[PDB]
Structure 1
Amino acid sequence: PAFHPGELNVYSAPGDVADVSRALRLTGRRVMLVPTMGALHEGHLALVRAAKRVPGSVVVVSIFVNPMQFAYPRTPDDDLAQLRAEGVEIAFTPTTAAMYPDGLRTTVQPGPLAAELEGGPRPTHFAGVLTVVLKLLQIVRPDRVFFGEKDYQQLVLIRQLVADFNLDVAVVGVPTVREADGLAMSSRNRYLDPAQRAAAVALSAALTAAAHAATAGAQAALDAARAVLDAAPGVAVDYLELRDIGLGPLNGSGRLLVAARLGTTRLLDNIAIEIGTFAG
């Protein structure tokens, strides 16, 4: 397949991008993978910009959504335009047929973390995610793969996949990008009406209140977050949990995670927490 450098090259066949990627790597380029669902916003552009900054980098951005056999925003044209503007040179847009010619046959079984937090009500969700991440990693064989911290549990599970199957790829976690008031950027934010968008600031306010409260201990940090969420009218909290950084249920460093509903829209956010001395 053709590859025009300094232009955006779009491939849909896995064999096409795998051949292009291999050829580029043989000629010294380091292949960077940014896996996405499409509906790209500035939080995805932060991953692209981190990938671009690796010297010698060729950036592959994949766009794929799992089929739902038994609502997700799909803006393809528009995604590719953003990529061109970022000077990405390869978009990989495989069909469902090319990814699952045999339906779901061999799959990845995550460890016990997948049954907690986001997985509690959807016990098979992360098996779906990690199966596609492993396939994309085998098709593209990147040097580095980039994920947002906004989906923190997904990130931890991806690092478990990479460690547990001895994958030769470095996983790069990229900090969440936020709107001016603190709201974490998400494709789902478009589903908030104006009142809901106003109320949704409480997630990030609660988290950053807790991160500063934490000089007083874990309980004070948790109670500060809960109070702020309790003060927010249309916010229905699904969970608010403080865990160790690898999402084991805690020492001096932790991660605080929240999930909440605003009407039908489910929002997540999370923050680094340092208990006692030092931080803040």
Structure 2
Amino acid sequence: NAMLIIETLPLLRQQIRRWRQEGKRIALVPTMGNLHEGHMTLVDEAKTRADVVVVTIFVNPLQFERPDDLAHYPRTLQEDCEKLTRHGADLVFAPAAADIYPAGLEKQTYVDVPALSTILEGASRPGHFRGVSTIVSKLFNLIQPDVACFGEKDYQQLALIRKMVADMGYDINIVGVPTVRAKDGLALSSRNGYLTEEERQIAPQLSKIMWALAEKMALGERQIDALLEEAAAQLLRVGFTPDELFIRDAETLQPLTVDSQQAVILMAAWLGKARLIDNQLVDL
């Protein structure tokens, strides 16, 4: 069937009710548009896990702590829909912010996930993760999916949503999808477009340094402090300006303990105009 494109809440409601009454398993892929091949692998994964796949395109003002950053977020609906139809999305839901938050942002009911919202990336971004957990909860309530796909690329987001889902009683399988990489290993991001030609040839070093760190851990290394210092050194020597680096429990993002079963390595570093990031799971 032709892909449906819905902008209003009443028309969305009609359709979701129909699918729920028909017994269709529903997958949800939340996005903010400006889609690339990474997003398309989310849709591909969703397709294997459900009867119908809903993809949202919504630049969420509640998660932008600088309100002007909304003004500058790329809007490319036609291009996004071209891609989505080709990957078999059944419904694209692309609402106006006025329809999602008609009572404004300050007095909008919100969902907050303690600790995961305020550590690491949340520490310098008060209110960002509240906006994420709120919109995702709302979309879950609107669309009633059995499965929802998120990129591992945005790892703290993924961990946050997993916690929310466990805590709030959602019967939803949260699927983390690995990042698409270039043949040279560079993780796919809209950010990559901001690199110069010379910078694009340095960029693959972030994953290589990460994977060197992960290999040491696979054998048994656990002096987290030293591992990270090394990696910041190497980032500098090959032309990045490192940001802070971390190795944390994959579920809580807290420092590893003897009960932690999985770690996540969290890399971030500047290359000219772009702050690039990557991550890697380590079985402990």
In structure 2, the partner of 1:38 is 33
Deviations 1:185-223 (A, max 9, x none): 112222222222222212211111111122250236435
Instruction: Answer yes or no: is the 8 Å Cα contact 2:42–2:149 preserved in 1.
Output: yes
Cα distance in 2 for partners of 1:195, 1:255 equals 29
* C-alpha deviation, 1:54, in angstroms: 2.0
Find the counterpart in structure 2 of residue 258 from structure 1: 267
In structure 1, C-alpha distance between the alignment counterparts of 2:249 and 2:32, rounded to whole Å = 28
Aligned to 1:151: 154
Moved more, 66-75 or 29-38: 66-75
Question: Match of 1:226?
Answer: 232
In 1: Cα distance, 2:117 partner to 2:102 partner:
26
Which residue number in structure 1 is paired with residue 60 of structure 2?
66
What's the offset of the Cα at 1:179? 1.1
- Residues 204-215 of structure 1 correspond to what in structure 2 (within 5 A)? 204-214=207-217, 215=219
Contact preservation (8 Å) 1:200, 1:262: yes
Match of 1:129 in 2: 132
Instruction: Provide the TM-score with structure 1 as the length reference.
Output: 0.90
- Separation in 1, partners of 2:149, 2:19: 19
> 5 Å matches for 1:235-254?
235-246=240-251, 247-250=253-256, 251=258, 253-254=262-263
Could you tell me which amino acid in structure 2 is paired with residue 38 of structure 1? G
Instruction: Please give the alpha-carbon distance, in whole angstroms, between the structure 1 residues aligned to 2:276 and 2:101.
Output: 29
Deviation at 1:14?
2.0
The one-letter code of the counterpart of 1:113 is L
Please state how far the C-alpha of 1:225 moved relative to its aligned partner.
Answer: 3.0
Percent pairwise identity: 45
What is the aligned partner in structure 1 of residue 185 from structure 2? 182
Aligned 8 A contact 1:206 1:224 in 2: no
Partner of residue 7, structure 1 = 2
Moved more, 202-211 or 62-71: 62-71
Counterparts of 1:46 and 1:201 in 2: how far apart (Å)? Answer: 21
Q: Note the 1:14-29 alignment, pairs <5 A.
A: 14-29=9-24
* Greater Cα shift, 155-164 or 59-68: 59-68
Distance 1:198 1:17 in 2: 45
The one-letter code of the counterpart of 1:248 is Q
Separation (CA, whole Å) in 2 of partners of 1:137 and 1:20 = 14
TM-score norm. by structure 2 comes to: 0.89
Answer whether contact 1:176 1:185 (CA < 8 A) is retained: yes
1:49 aligns with 2:44: yes
Structure 1 residue runs of 5 or longer lacking an equivalent are 1-5, 276-280
Local SS of the residue matching 1:177: coil
Task: Identify the range of structure 1 (176-185 vs 197-206) with the bigger mean alpha-carbon deviation.
Answer: 197-206
Aligned length: 268
Q: Which stretch has the larger CA shift, 152-161 or 190-199?
A: 190-199
